[PDB]
């Protein structure tokens, strides 16, 4: 009964594509490129080496390229009606059949679930997701006899290897299991095997896995009460806003198996209603992921994340095209496709190409957005505040743990200007798929530096990470949204609280992106209110990007670089300079990508200002030599940090003109600093430009009227904040 192909590329799709070839430029260009890639590999032959290497090494790269080429050859066979591509697929599949059944477990031992073709079952699963698509395309070209042998001695044993033989890999809520479930489900759908389809959807019953079983990034295999299978992987790690809890770098990775297996289920098993599952979260999550990119389309490096990953990736070409075709045909997705400059060679890519040709493209709007975390949207979140035409972007992370890849980074932020990183989230310590750096795998310093709180722009207490850097503790906690109000494009405000990172301490951080008279550009206002039951040492880092220009405080320069501390990331920071404040406001300015920036922060006489540089205890040169300024406030119980980050002026080494190189801040002052209310007065240097932000800290209700006095003058407003011009 079942047609082949039908999962991704459909029979009707092949006919529609063939009818339009030559009149769909983005598709035609992709077809030419892919045909040339596959033809070159056909010329080189068929290589299925005995597996040996980690990522970047020959056997890994060869088996990886093979799965990409097989899927490409499958669609070429169908679209071009050229059996040279079917013959290549047949010959490669049979060469695999000749070796796979006799392979040992992969000789590399790092993985908690060692693969056969690859060092880990994740990559064997990648292979089967792609190869299942190729098999769907050549199914009718093969004889019944050929299909029987491939299914019996290659595909069914492979599907069992990555599932029932490795339930620790397969049966989780984790990107690994999403790939595993998709691999088993895709091949099950092609073969019409109900057992495998059910195993894909609902996982393995009674897996026998014990308590506290972990993998290699610090994460539990199983979580009490959680289901397994594809549907569990949709329900648990996505919020109702389509935010994937591992963060955008890993959301990017998981989007491929999520949307490909969803597409396959939609086409073969429409009764599953997979695109309606969890209030249509998979389709929504594509928009959400695109919103988590900077002006150049590069995903914000939250949690474990390599900088440079972007919506130009193959996963986002796939996700955009599937979301366009199977969703509500959102014309904003077509502008992303135009930027990508390629489409999938299937029904969905054709739909995108036709939408573009018909003049339907609309610009993808990059907006201020509140995203919830947790399956029910009640476990913190992530906020993005954007000014104007994506002119300045603040990312505030008040999220849940994020599973294994999560960082100890409650209430951290990062700042960008038109695709230039200004205040960074470090990302991972890993050179992804570069064999020369620890086999392309996570490095020691991912744990010892990149995950630690001191590596982030957030509060560190007593040189200890949030939750003492203990995964099992952090996994039980999330920061809490206090309020989000981005309605005023000139004054956008978000506020969140964290009281479990350091038991006995309450952190309440409010961030605002504010455009006001006296300043060339919007600035960031950062209020970090700290309450505690004991005198502590508080560190507040700012990991700036660029060349130091000026300070308004003196600092000493040591004759030798010593580490800042001994543990929890401090062992990776060199102490490059130590400043003492000259007064109530301390300022650091720098130049980055032709623009000046100034950090102004409210300082006390006994504060220390630490210039630091990353790179201590880094024997393999695994860390970047980036700099930071850390405010250290010793022997302090309750305190409120108040900072402004300005962007101003410009420099060019062509014109050699320096323009507006100084700050426009005259003064920032806490006018009220209580548990119930915080008030910050901001004075610009030009003319009578004064503004006041007042925060109500213990009642978020939008209709609650507040009455306070500052210097014998009454201020009245409704809701959790007011920003007023002081005349």
Up-side HSE of residue 117: CA atoms within 13 Å toward CB? 28
Q: Does residue 416 belong to the site contacting Ca ion (CB under 5 A)? A: yes
CA 195 to chain CA centroid, nearest Å: 34
Our finding on whether 294 is near Ca ion (CB under 5 A) is: yes
Q: Which listed option, Mg ion, a copy of itself, Ca ion, none, makes contact with residue 625 (CB within 5 to 8 Å by class)? A: a copy of itself
DSSP letters spanning 139-190: TTTS-HHHHHHHIIIIIHHHHHHTTTT-HHHHSSSSHHHHHHHHHHHHHHHH
- Minimum Å distance from CB 596 to a copy of itself? 9
Strands 713-718, 650-651: pairing kind = unpaired
346, 425, 539, 618: which one contacts Ca ion (CB under 5 A)? Answer: 425
Nearest distance from C-beta of residue 310 to Ca ion, angstroms: 12
In angstroms, what CA-CA distances link 606 with 542, 586, 630?
19, 12, 14
Residue 661 binds a copy of itself, judged by CB under 8 A? yes
**According to CB under 5 A, which residues from 371 to 400 bind Ca ion?**
393
> Which of these ranges, 155-163, 189-197, 430-438, 676-684, lies near a copy of itself under the rule CB under 8 A?
430-438
Sign of CA dihedral 682, 700, 382, 287: negative
Determine if residue 425 is labeled as part of a ligand binding site: yes
Of 250, 408, 471, 482, catalytic: 250
What is the H or E stretch that residue 511 is in? strand 505-514
Contact between 716 and a copy of itself by CB under 8 A: the answer reads no
Q: Which residues bind Mg ion (CB under 5 A)?
A: 51, 59-60, 111-112, 118, 175, 178, 216, 233, 237, 294-295, 393, 416, 419
Site size toward Ca ion (CB under 5 A) is: 7
Tokens linked to 358: 């018909």
Contact between 687 and a copy of itself per CB under 8 A: no
488 or 652: whose CB is closer to a copy of itself?
A: 652
Q: Does 263 sit near Ca ion (CB under 5 A)? A: no
Region from 193-201, 205-213, 519-527, 650-658 binding a copy of itself, contact rule CB under 8 A:
650-658
* CB-based contact 444:113 (threshold 8 Å): no
Q: Answer yes or no: are the C-beta atoms of 411 and 541 closer than 8 Å.
A: no
- The C-alpha atoms of residue 163 and residue 177 are separated, in whole angstroms, by 9
Among 176, 397, 407, 632, the residue binding Ca ion under the rule CB under 5 A is 407
Active site residue 266: no
Note if 405 is an active site residue. yes
- CA torsion angle 715 718 723 724 (round to 10): -40
Alpha-carbon gap, residue 25 to 23, rounded angstroms:
6
- Residue tagged 């290897």 (tokens): 161
625 annotated among ligand-binding-site residues = no
Using CB under 5 A as the binding rule, whether residue 572 contacts Ca ion is answered as no
253 annotated binding-site participant: yes
51 binds, among Mg ion, Ca ion, a copy of itself, none (CB under 5 to 8 A by kind): Mg ion
State the minimum distance, in angstroms, from the CB of residue 661 to a copy of itself.
Answer: 6
CA-CA distance, 119 to 95, in Å (whole number)? 20
Rounded alpha-carbon distances, angstroms, from residue 716 to 622, 713, 721, 723? 54, 10, 10, 11
607: exposed, middle or buried (Cβ count in 10 Å: 0-12, 13-18, 19+): buried
State the residues that interact with a copy of itself by CB under 8 A. Answer: 55-56, 61, 306-310, 312-314, 431-437, 440, 547-550, 557, 559-563, 574, 576, 589, 591, 611, 613, 615, 617-619, 621, 624-625, 627, 651-658, 661-662
Binding-site residue numbers for Ca(2+) are 407, 409, 425, 456
Binding-site residue numbers are 59, 178, 244, 250, 253, 294, 407, 409, 419, 425, 430, 456
Positions annotated as catalytic residues are: 250, 405
């Amino acid at each position: 009964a079942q047609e082949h192909p039908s999962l991704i590329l459909t029979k009707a799709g092949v006919e529609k594509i063939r009818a339009e070839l030559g009149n769909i430029p983005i598709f035609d260009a992709t077809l030419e490129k892919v045909k040339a890639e596959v033809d070159a590999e056909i010329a080189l032959g068929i290589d299925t080496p005995l597996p040996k290497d980690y990522s970047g090494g020959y056997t890994h790269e060869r088996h990886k390229r093979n799965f990409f080429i097989l899927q490409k050859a499958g669609v070429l066979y169908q679209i071009l009606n050229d059996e040279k591509y079917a013959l290549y697929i047949k010959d490669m599949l049979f060469q695999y059949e000749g070796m796979y059944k006799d392979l040992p477990v992969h000789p590399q031992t790092r993985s908690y679930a060692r693969g056969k073709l690859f060092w880990q079952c994740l990559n064997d699963s990648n292979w089967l997701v792609y190869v299942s698509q190729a098999y769907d395309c050549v199914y009718d070209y093969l004889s019944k006899k050929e299909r029987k042998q491939l299914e019996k001695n290659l595909f069914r044993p492979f599907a069992d290897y990555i599932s029932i033989e490795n339930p620790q890999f397969y049966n989780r809520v984790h990107n690994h299991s999403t790939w595993g479930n998709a691999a088993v489900g895709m091949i099950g759908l092609v073969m019409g095997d109900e057992e495998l389809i059910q195993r894909a959807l609902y996982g393995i019953e009674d897996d026998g896995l014990p308590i506290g079983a972990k993998d290699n990034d610090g994460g539990f295999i199983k979580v009490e009460g959680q289901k397994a299978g594809f549907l569990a992987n949709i329900d648990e790690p996505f919020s109702p806003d389509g935010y994937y809890t591992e963060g955008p770098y890993y959301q990017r990775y998981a989007m491929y198996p999520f949307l490909i297996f969803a597409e396959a289920l939609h086409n073969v098993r429409p009764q599953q209603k997979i695109f309606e599952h969890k209030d249509g979260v998979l389709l929504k999550s594509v928009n959400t992921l695109l919103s988590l990119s900077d002006a150049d389309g590069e995903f914000f490096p939250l949690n474990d994340a390599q900088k440079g990953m972007s919506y130009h990736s193959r996963e986002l070409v796939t996700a955009v095209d599937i979301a366009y075709h199977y969703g509500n045909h959102n014309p904003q997705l077509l502008s992303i496709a135009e930027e990508q400059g390629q489409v999938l060679l299937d029904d969905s890519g054709l739909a995108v190409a036709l939408g573009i040709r018909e003049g339907k493209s609309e610009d993808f709007q990059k907006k201020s957005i509140k995203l919830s975390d947790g399956a029910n949207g009640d476990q913190g979140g992530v906020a993005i505040l954007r000014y104007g035409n994506e002119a300045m972007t603040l990312v505030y992370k008040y999220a849940a743990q994020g599973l294994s890849h999560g960082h100890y980074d409650k209430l951290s932020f990062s700042l960008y200007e038109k695709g230039t990183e200004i205040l960074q989230d470090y990302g991972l310590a890993r050179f992804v798929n570069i064999e020369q750096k620890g086999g392309g795998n996570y490095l020691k310093e991912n744990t010892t530096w990149a995950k630690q709180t001191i590596a982030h722009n957030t509060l560190v207490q007593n040189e200890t990470s949030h939750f003492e850097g203990k995964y099992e503790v952090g996994s039980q906690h999330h920061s809490e949204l206090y309020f989000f109000d981005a309605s005023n494009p000139e004054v956008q405000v978000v506020s969140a609280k964290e009281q479990n990172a350091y038991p006995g301490t309450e952190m309440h951080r409010t961030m605002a992106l504010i455009k006001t008279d006296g300043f060339e550009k919007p600035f960031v206002l950062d209020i970090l209110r700290v309450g505690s039951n004991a005198a502590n040492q508080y560190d507040l880092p700012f990991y700036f990007k660029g060349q130091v220009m000026q300070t308004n405080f003196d600092f000493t320069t040591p004759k030798s670089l010593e580490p800042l501390g001994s543990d929890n990331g401090y062992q990776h920071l060199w102490s490059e300079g130590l400043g003492q404040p000259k007064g109530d406001n301390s300022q650091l300015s720098w130049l980055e990508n032709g623009r000046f920036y100034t950090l102004t922060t409210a300082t006390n006489n006994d504060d220390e200002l630490h210039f630091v540089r990353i790179g201590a205890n880094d024997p393999e040169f695994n860390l970047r030599r980036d700099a930071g300024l850390i405010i250290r406030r010793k022997n302090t119980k309750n305190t409120t940090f108040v900072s402004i980050l300005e962007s101003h002026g410009h420099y060019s080494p062509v014109s050699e003109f320096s323009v507006n190189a100084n700050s426009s801040i005259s003064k920032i002052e806490l006018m009220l600093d209580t548990k119930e209310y915080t008030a910050v007065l901001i004075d610009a240097k030009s003319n009578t430009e004064q503004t006041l932000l007042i925060l109500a800290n213990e009642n978020k209700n939008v209709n609650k009227e507040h009455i306070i006095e500052i210097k014998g003058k009454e201020y009245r407003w409704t809701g959790p904040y007011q920003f007023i011009k002081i005349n």
